[PDB]
Design a protein around this ligand. Sequence first.
Ligand SMILES: Cc1cc2c(cc1C)N(C[C@H](O)[C@H](O)[C@H](O)COP(=O)(O)OP(=O)(O)OC[C@H]1O[C@@H](n3cnc4c(N)ncnc43)[C@H](O)[C@@H]1O)c1[nH]c(=O)[nH]c(=O)c1N2
Ligand SMILES: Cc1cc2c(cc1C)N(C[C@H](O)[C@H](O)[C@H](O)COP(=O)(O)OP(=O)(O)OC[C@H]1O[C@@H](n3cnc4c(N)ncnc43)[C@H](O)[C@@H]1O)c1[nH]c(=O)[nH]c(=O)c1N2
Ligand SMILES: Cc1cc2c(cc1C)N(C[C@H](O)[C@H](O)[C@H](O)COP(=O)(O)OP(=O)(O)OC[C@H]1O[C@@H](n3cnc4c(N)ncnc43)[C@H](O)[C@@H]1O)c1[nH]c(=O)[nH]c(=O)c1N2
Ligand SMILES: Cc1cc2c(cc1C)N(C[C@H](O)[C@H](O)[C@H](O)COP(=O)(O)OP(=O)(O)OC[C@H]1O[C@@H](n3cnc4c(N)ncnc43)[C@H](O)[C@@H]1O)c1[nH]c(=O)[nH]c(=O)c1N2
Ligand SMILES: [Cl-]
Ligand SMILES: [Cl-]
Ligand SMILES: [Cl-]
Ligand SMILES: [Cl-]
Ligand SMILES: [Cl-]
Ligand SMILES: [Cl-]
Ligand SMILES: [Cl-]
Ligand SMILES: [Cl-]
Lengths: 387, 387, 387, 387
Amino acid sequence: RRGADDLIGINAVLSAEEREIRDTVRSVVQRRIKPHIASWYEDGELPARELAVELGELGLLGMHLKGYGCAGMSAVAYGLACLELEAGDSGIRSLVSVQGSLAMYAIHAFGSDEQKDQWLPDMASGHRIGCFGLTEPDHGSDPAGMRTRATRSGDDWILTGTKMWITNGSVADVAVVWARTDEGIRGFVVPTDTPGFTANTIKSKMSLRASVTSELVLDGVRLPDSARLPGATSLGAPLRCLNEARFGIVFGALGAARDCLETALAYACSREQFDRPIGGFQLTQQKLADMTLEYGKGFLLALHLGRQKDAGELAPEQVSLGKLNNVREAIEIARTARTVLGASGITGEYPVMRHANNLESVLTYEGTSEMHTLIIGQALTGVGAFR
Amino acid sequence: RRGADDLIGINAVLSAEEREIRDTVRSVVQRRIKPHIASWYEDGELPARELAVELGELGLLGMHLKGYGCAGMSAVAYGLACLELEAGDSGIRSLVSVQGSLAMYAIHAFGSDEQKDQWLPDMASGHRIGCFGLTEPDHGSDPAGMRTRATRSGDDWILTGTKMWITNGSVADVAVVWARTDEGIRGFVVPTDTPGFTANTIKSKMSLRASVTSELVLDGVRLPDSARLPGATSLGAPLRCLNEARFGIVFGALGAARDCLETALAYACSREQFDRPIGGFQLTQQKLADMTLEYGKGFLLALHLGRQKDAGELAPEQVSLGKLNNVREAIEIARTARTVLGASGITGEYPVMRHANNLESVLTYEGTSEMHTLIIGQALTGVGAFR
Amino acid sequence: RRGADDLIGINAVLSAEEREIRDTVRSVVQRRIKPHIASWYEDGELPARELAVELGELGLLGMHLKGYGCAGMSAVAYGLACLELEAGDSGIRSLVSVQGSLAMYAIHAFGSDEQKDQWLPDMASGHRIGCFGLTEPDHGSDPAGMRTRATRSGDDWILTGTKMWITNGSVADVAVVWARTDEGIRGFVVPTDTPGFTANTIKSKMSLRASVTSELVLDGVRLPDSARLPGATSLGAPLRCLNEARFGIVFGALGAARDCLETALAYACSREQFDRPIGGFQLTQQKLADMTLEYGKGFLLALHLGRQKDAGELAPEQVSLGKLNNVREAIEIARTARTVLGASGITGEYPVMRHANNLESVLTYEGTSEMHTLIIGQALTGVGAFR
Amino acid sequence: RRGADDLIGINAVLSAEEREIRDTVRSVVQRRIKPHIASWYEDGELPARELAVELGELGLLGMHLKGYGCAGMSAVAYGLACLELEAGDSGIRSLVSVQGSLAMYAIHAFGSDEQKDQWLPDMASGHRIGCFGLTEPDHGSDPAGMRTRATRSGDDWILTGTKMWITNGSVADVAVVWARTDEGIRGFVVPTDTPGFTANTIKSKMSLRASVTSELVLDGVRLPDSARLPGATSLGAPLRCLNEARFGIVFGALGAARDCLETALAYACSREQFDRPIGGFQLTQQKLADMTLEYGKGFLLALHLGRQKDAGELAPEQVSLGKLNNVREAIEIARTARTVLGASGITGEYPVMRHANNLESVLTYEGTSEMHTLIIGQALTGVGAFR
Ligand SMILES: Cc1cc2c(cc1C)N(C[C@H](O)[C@H](O)[C@H](O)COP(=O)(O)OP(=O)(O)OC[C@H]1O[C@@H](n3cnc4c(N)ncnc43)[C@H](O)[C@@H]1O)c1[nH]c(=O)[nH]c(=O)c1N2
Ligand SMILES: Cc1cc2c(cc1C)N(C[C@H](O)[C@H](O)[C@H](O)COP(=O)(O)OP(=O)(O)OC[C@H]1O[C@@H](n3cnc4c(N)ncnc43)[C@H](O)[C@@H]1O)c1[nH]c(=O)[nH]c(=O)c1N2
Ligand SMILES: Cc1cc2c(cc1C)N(C[C@H](O)[C@H](O)[C@H](O)COP(=O)(O)OP(=O)(O)OC[C@H]1O[C@@H](n3cnc4c(N)ncnc43)[C@H](O)[C@@H]1O)c1[nH]c(=O)[nH]c(=O)c1N2
Ligand SMILES: Cc1cc2c(cc1C)N(C[C@H](O)[C@H](O)[C@H](O)COP(=O)(O)OP(=O)(O)OC[C@H]1O[C@@H](n3cnc4c(N)ncnc43)[C@H](O)[C@@H]1O)c1[nH]c(=O)[nH]c(=O)c1N2
Ligand SMILES: [Cl-]
Ligand SMILES: [Cl-]
Ligand SMILES: [Cl-]
Ligand SMILES: [Cl-]
Ligand SMILES: [Cl-]
Ligand SMILES: [Cl-]
Ligand SMILES: [Cl-]
Ligand SMILES: [Cl-]
């Protein structure tokens, strides 16, 4: 029996430095996440604040950023880290994506030196948690239509609106909030203790239950001009953040896929029915071959994109190739794997249903499958088809 | 806007009697199931005993059986009832399938007059709950390999083994248990208070959470010969029961599909993005068209099979056409529908994730997709390919 | 071994009258089409004029029309006839569709009594061949944009434009030609000997090679006002004709599917590999089950639509369900069947490649898959998404 | 507008040497193959002998072999060459695959020095054409079951049997023929002028029409022992040859895909319907995105396998990943591309139907999709499921 990674030949196309980072994160996941995750997911509650500190002190927050206590690792090493985190759980990887590639990235890329120096080192250590308030109840795929507004009042700004589906929102110390102004989209560094700001936890989730997801109500929150991100002057600012986060998801989704594929492979060799291992039936082999193919193609695509990113050669339409492909192929792998487990596959004895349900959120967030199709389509044709 | 049933033209191919039964069950579901189901599913607990009484007193237990207080309705009317029940929830329809088409059916078909007279009227009223113990930890798709044994001891039988994944097991008054004997497979009517018999509820389910699913331990349970089902003399007896239950699932799965499709259709007309209803985008219309097609083809297949069943013309390989097709197409409808809802689709605000997760169990139980493929294949070729 | 029709149970849902018509057409196909079709297809040439006479004298032209020597058969019987014709070859069924459901239908529905009396009886006998000139080089899916014009000159009309992909065009005696005028779309009965009218046969076809497909050049063709179809006053006139033809295709495509499925079933039982019939392998059974399911669902959909049509209950969006589904599922059946035949499947020893290539034209013509998706989508949502 | 190769970023992961070879072969294809291929394919006839000389003198026969006038290029460069050849036509690439990776390879790997010195330089120049006789009428996927026999007669061998579907057979000077003997499978270098040897061209092909495909009849062909390949002592010998040829197909199939994708991309930008380029509709963009993804994933898989092959790290189950994936994804690309062209796509004005029909043979030969599934399955599970 050859495992999927062995059959694909993954280690041989990575460096020793990359493999070391991957191995380090895998060990963190096996030790600190996997023993608890079934319970956190079932309960829909996790010690998010304590976990952020743990992960930050381990060097896992802001991994792809430079300075301020961050790891400054390569795009490929960061990708491998995300893959390992998500093999643990997509909710856990989501906490990390929002912290580093959304909230910290926004401050790193568009913030004043005062904002960077105030927030980034404590965010890298996990002692202060961020969130990224873009989506609203009525505006998700079309953030250009956002209705949260920032209006001037003397030297201050007044922020009024509601953000929805905001990861980490209820446990966040700081919110990077996007708003429309009379001169275009702007972003603000919003301490969550500011009067007028409330965060409400979303309950009854059937996906991403080991993550905090919130409504943010900005009920006329008054901020000084110094709270504005000076470098953010258009919708392109939040979109640059999304493209950073999307890259991590390109790798991350493959971790959930891998965990499911490995589960199905092991089960197909151990479980017998009709006097042979179920892996000895053609219909089982078809599934295992198909899943291994999409995992391997997805990994080679992710690695290619990461190598391009490190070389400085990576556009949003290229990231969209990876995001469109790897998330939908991952969720199909999870679904197929569950069928191989039969009834055993319907409980948290195995990770497959958790992965499959989690991947519903990953499929939708950071641009739906349709959004990525249209981004790629526009690149290929020169014609937008969003409207 | 035309709804899916209107576009397909369903009412015109049903009788007034059939439509009345359908409407009656729909009203029961809307009144007695839908207001509570989100909570029952989340909690993984429901008042199963009280619900059985409610459903029985409403005429909904043993619907397709004749006599003993049962409705004696046609195959088509029974199918429509199952569709409505499952549009409520597959777990609820499962409680009903096990009660009527498995446990009562077995007694009705193979029982002595003493067994029928003792058990069936109280089962039809819901005052006594049954379960059907075929599957074991190591034998599911291949029940011919079952290892639960029944051995003679004087005039008594001693039953020893474990059954697993048994719907209603922990709340059952009576268990119809299948065992191997020196002269072939036999079935027994096992009061669950018999010494040596225990039932343990399976927890941590990610599917069918509004149903009771159990392990049955038969630790040398001593029964008189009068507990044996006299008419059951081979594996064909439990298989006849499965074919009755499978028929109800052929219709039932379409109810979960319908509920999801209707949800997606309504949302596509109400939700706007990029300044139009999302139903005004081609990619949305593709989904809605594809889902409506598979729902309608699945319904026409179910109706055809039901008409054959009423005419006396329905073989197991024909039932397998419906079971193979309608469950996998239903789960694909649920999955696709969830994508149309975006983030809103990930909570129990909408029924789609519950339906999709429930359908995992329906896909596996009563013969997996692979089993039905091989049943149809053997019919088409004359050659078995199970081994 | 049960054949697909036997497993589905088709004869039991048809009348004796319907079965008789079906059987009669099957015999015509077996005797007059199947012995020659491989040669006609390879050559890309067939005795179309002689064949039209044969088919007309057999009662097969204008089958669903009433009067003028036409059969006046039901929608269901007509459908079954089309299925049998296409099981022979889609090109042959195309000749018939254009003759009856397009060219004759247009005259029957919108013509003057003079036009009907002049043309229809000789068209029903096959002694005069029609064609239906809607599509142009630059306008296919959007016939509202057609640029062929009809302009008044005294009491005459002058028709100027080019029609393209016109079945029967080079062998037609009469062309029903659609044109834009200052008062909307109009249709004309155009004798093909009219000065200025030329028809050029399209060559190098890789599909529908046993059909004549042509360019029509109307180079200022002068016609009296009596050539205008008086009842045709908008784009809805040619669209009504298309909806008649589409209905026949709903059934027709299933004939090509059936022929391929039957071929694969027979081969799977006869061909041995690895010491068993290839039908004894699970992967083969998967294909045979899947194909049989889509054939049967497609047939039940077609029959349902035909029963609605006879009852007067059939809208264009309902026809589109059948056209969208049955053509794409038929072509997938043909493709899958070819794989079962291995190398033997690549020559005209078997009909599968001819059917698969023919179905490319059927998938595109009478509204592409995308057009039908959007017709169904608009019906479901109330919102057009063509633009 | 970004082309597919540009969007994927292919040149940046190749060397200048690799790009030069690719470019050289592309120019040969554009100049010597593309102007004639529509006619050769339609006619089912090509100047195969003259073409072999042309290709050999250009260095394109035996590209991956060392010595004897062969190019000795890397696995990656050879792959790129095959991709370019097949973008021309799969039939043409097939002539090359059989010449180099089957017939020459067999002699190179298992032949005596006398055989190598006699045959290989004239095969590399194209002045002598080879074929590879493994498949028989009744044994294709299971060559272990072959019935062509070689029996000893004094110091001679007598070869008796029929080989079928043999590329280049009717134009071959030499046939590498596999036979069963009393001591296992053996291979023979068979001059085609040997008495008793006849080759018959297979006609009525609907695929690979620009290739010669033949029946070989070995009617008691008498050969000296020196005709035996000394190094071939089991079924593993012909299988090693297949694994060499399969590798070239992993790349080759992507060339047919590319040509189709490029065709669809150009057409989507040029063709207007409903007042916009058809590439401006969402359903068109979905197709273009999906095709580009599978082309790019397939290319990254091929390149990965080629890099492994050059490093000495490439097993048959790894080759099977590429063969299974790239051929079925290529044929799906061709099919999808044809739909984008509408009616224009059904003639040889565009290359898509030729590519799609050619790929039917590529899907089947060198191991069917099912064979590759089972090779991968056995590697993953340790259990064979062929029987
Ligand atoms: C658990 C979780 C966590 C988060 C988030 C979501 C979830 C579920 N998101 C929000 C996420 O980014 C958001 O859900 C997506 O952008 C999709 O937006 P909507 O859900 O509003 O769907 P929306 O209403 O946009 O779309 C609904 C459906 O219509 C389709 N559609 C929309 N426009 C279309 C068009 N023009 N053409 C074709 N189809 C179209 C969509 O693809 C989708 O299928 C978030 N956000 C945030 O700011 N910060 C965060 O931390 C997170 N985290
Ligand atoms: C919630 C719920 C509720 C119930 C039940 C299940 C569940 C999940 N069932 C049990 C159910 O019938 C059982 O799960 C199925 O028969 C499948 O058996 P296993 O789960 O053991 O899978 P099993 O181990 O048989 O199969 C595992 C996988 O291997 C495949 N496979 C097996 N044999 C194969 C072959 N020869 N060729 C190809 N593939 C093959 C299967 O298709 C599946 O994908 C049950 N039972 C009962 O007796 N009473 C009840 O009330 C219920 N209720
Ligand atoms: C062999 C044969 C025979 C005939 C015919 C065709 C063929 C191949 N037809 C013509 C046929 O009706 C025509 O090909 C189709 O209507 C499609 O039009 P075009 O080929 O111009 O494609 P067109 O250019 O319209 O479309 C090209 C592609 O773009 C897509 N597309 C177009 N608009 C779109 C939109 N708004 N949104 C999304 N996608 C869109 C299409 O679905 C297609 O995939 C015909 N005609 C006739 O009048 N009489 C006849 O007898 C016949 N017979
Ligand atoms: C144009 C062209 C050109 C060539 C060739 C073919 C063609 C079409 N081939 C022959 C080719 O290698 C051969 O067609 C394939 O190996 C498949 O064998 P059969 O066609 O006999 O199908 P076969 O009869 O083996 O299989 C029929 C079907 O059954 C399936 N099947 C078979 N066994 C199965 C199993 N155990 N489980 C599941 N499914 C199974 C197959 O996958 C296939 O779908 C060839 N050969 C050669 O020696 N030299 C050459 O040059 C060429 N060239
Ligand atoms: Cl991050
Ligand atoms: Cl746009
Ligand atoms: Cl029941
Ligand atoms: Cl069997
Ligand atoms: Cl007709
Ligand atoms: Cl529109
Ligand atoms: Cl070669
Ligand atoms: Cl084997």
